[PDB]
């Protein structure tokens, strides 16, 4: 440079000091007190496809229980600040608070391995385009058929102290620049929702809203015909700053294309003129270029099983190292490898000795079996001003569940109190207010598990307890 | 224990629980009557090896 | 998906079989204001990202 020019250019300056998120290993002190908790045995019987309800009422007589649903359990732990220990001299309640930490988990499954089949009695299928002999004949009206398919195979298990977050493609509203005609394609949008117990997993047709994106109501099988298939948002759950929604996860997925079909309906977007050479006669009209495969999760094997094994959580993926804040845990489970649908039948008359189809009513049923076991460690937090600020910024309700805060009770300036509260020129002076809602997770449905009375201190009497004792060295019983 | 689904079939007999009307769109003509929604797979324990 | 009359693309081509060649742009590290910049001389040295 030989010239002196006026000004300067970009300079990336160091950012201002931020109060970073720290690991729970820095303010949550561990103790040697471990506890075993476990459910008795969790069974669920229902219909695999739809909930059988009364034809005139709406009471659900038989719920929907499919192997392709999300099992999101909401575990309830006893409050360690109220829990009754044999000796409470390990922590000082004037300056400390206790919390349960998750050390080991066993998600036990009960039924035999098996694959269940689902399908639509009127599925939107035109022809089988995998291997066509001649060009398709005339496509009439209502070319739907009865087609079944076994879905993609899926196992997963997410553990955290917040409910998991799932993604799916939904219907957004187009910008107010388009002349929207009827029968136009719905504009897509990725939506994040809390996965609740009973939501359908992605099954090989995509994580999408089959209620608002397919008014046909006949393109996917019966169980996902009007449901929302959700896929876990791993990109969002591992990127959360505190790591509460997910601090352990597994997943096994497999699928291949079994059959290759077509769709029936008016063409939405025709094939451009430069992608083919127009035909003549039979091939003068193009067949429907809307293809769709039927998924197939192949062989289910006992060796690819992720359940029935203990998981020892030593280093969580995020900053929350398995601390169950709020005395609460969330175990999400998908297992489409025990999805056998038992087909029953009933005889309308037990007399006839010749088979007649009109004599037997055929039903479908499905049974699930769970048994959850956790090993819980007891942790204590010494709440200084800094730890109190950090926790109040991380989760607002922790410091209010646990008696701590010393915040002002009334926080008020002046309240009005009219004399002659019974007059007719006082404009309805009733100081009598109702009470609002309290729990923010009331809008969701989870398989609630109450482990409040299920905590035990002698681990070697429980299978996961002695597995934990064995993996951690020490025995427990110097008896006899 | 290993297993896959070899064949996907249907069941015959009076339907015990009819499909709710809000799950599909009524047909006309051939498809005016629903086929059986009771499906059962034919299992197949795959190759046995030493 | 483009209009029959014009050629403005209404819906682009997005398939699982395309190359996704990303071109990552990085900030010039010589334009970083380090609190102790005396760690690199601007009259004889230059920085780069690895």
From Swiss-Prot, chain C:
Entry's localization field: Virion; Host nucleus
PTM summary: ISGylated by host HERC5, this results in dominant-negative effect on virus infectivity.
Domain of life per record: Viruses
Membrane-spanning parts: none
Protein family membership: Belongs to the papillomaviridae L1 protein family.
Other notes: HPV16, in comparison to HPV types 6 and 11, is more often associated with malignant genital cancers in humans.
Oligomeric and partner information: Self-assembles into homopentamers. The capsid has an icosahedral symmetry and consists of 72 capsomers, with each capsomer being a pentamer of L1. Interacts with the minor capsid protein L2; this interaction is necessary for viral genome encapsidation. Interacts with protein E2; this interaction enhances E2-dependent replication and transcription activation. Interacts with host KPNA2; this interaction mediates the nuclear localization of L1 capsomers. Interacts with host ITGA6. Interacts with host SDC1; this interaction promotes efficient infection of keratinocytes.
Described purpose of this protein according to its UniProt entry: Forms an icosahedral capsid with a T=7 symmetry and a 50 nm diameter. The capsid is composed of 72 pentamers linked to each other by disulfide bonds and associated with L2 proteins. Binds to heparan sulfate proteoglycans on cell surface of basal layer keratinocytes to provide initial virion attachment. This binding mediates a conformational change in the virus capsid that facilitates efficient infection. The virion enters the host cell via endocytosis. During virus trafficking, L1 protein dissociates from the viral DNA and the genomic DNA is released to the host nucleus.
The protein, known as: Major capsid protein L1
Annotated organism of origin: Human papillomavirus type 16
Lineage: Viruses, Monodnaviria, Shotokuvirae, Cossaviricota, Papovaviricetes
